[PDB]
Amino acid sequence: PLIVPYNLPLPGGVVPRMLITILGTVKPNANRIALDFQRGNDVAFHFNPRFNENNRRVIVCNTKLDNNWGREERQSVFPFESGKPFKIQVLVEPDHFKVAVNDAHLLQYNHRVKKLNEISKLGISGDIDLTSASYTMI
Numbered sequence: 001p002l003i004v005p006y007n008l009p010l011p012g013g014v015v016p017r018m019l020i021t022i023l024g025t026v027k028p029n030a031n032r033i034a035l036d037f038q039r040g041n042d043v044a045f046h047f048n049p050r051f052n053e054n055n056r057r058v059i060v061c062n063t064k065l066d067n068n069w070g071r072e073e074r075q076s077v078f079p080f081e082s083g084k085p086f087k088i089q090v091l092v093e094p095d096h097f098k099v100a101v102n103d104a105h106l107l108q109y110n111h112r113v114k115k116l117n118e119i120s121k122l123g124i125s126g127d128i129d130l131t132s133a134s135y136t137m138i
């Protein structure tokens with residue numbers, strides 16, 4: 001298994017048609033997962049499944065610029081299940097990151113950070129056993 005938190009370099013940043021695939025298993029009593037697409041210290045796209053936010057499950061997405069979080073985009077559709085294997089696919093499209101979980105579309109996140117070629121790291125953190133993290137062009 002891979003170490004968590006995991007640092008996946010994205011050489012030269014991201015580009016439309018780049019597909020990132022994360023495979024893992026959610027831990028028993030998981031609390032949180034995070035994917036952090038980073039441009040240096042900024043987080044261009046934070047994808048944060050929360051398993052117990054006021055006793056509800058929700059996905060919070062946001063961007064961090066100069067150490068400040070912006071406006072959250074929340075998705076109450078929650079495809080993750082504690083204890084179970086998952087696949088997250090993040091497809092970079094021209095105007096947004098497109099996320100599918102277990103082969104079902106989940107959400108799109110419009111690019112706030114526009115220098116895609118500078119979004120050169122993906123951090124994977126939280127309450128998972130991480131099996132694989134990779135990218136390819138489609």
Ligand SMILES: Cc1ccc(S[C@@H]2O[C@H](CO)[C@H](O)[C@H](n3cc(-c4c(F)c(F)c(N=[N+]=[N-])c(F)c4F)nn3)[C@H]2O)cc1
Binds near residue numbers: 061127
């Ligand atoms: C005015 C105001 C602004 C923000 C807040 S809350 C803030 O909200 C933003 C999204 O808007 C982010 O979710 C922030 N976050 C999450 C994590 C994180 C982590 F640190 C971990 F270590 C994780 N896993 N492991 N281990 C893991 F999954 C994580 F998500 N880091 N930062 C969160 O603090 C409250 C009030």
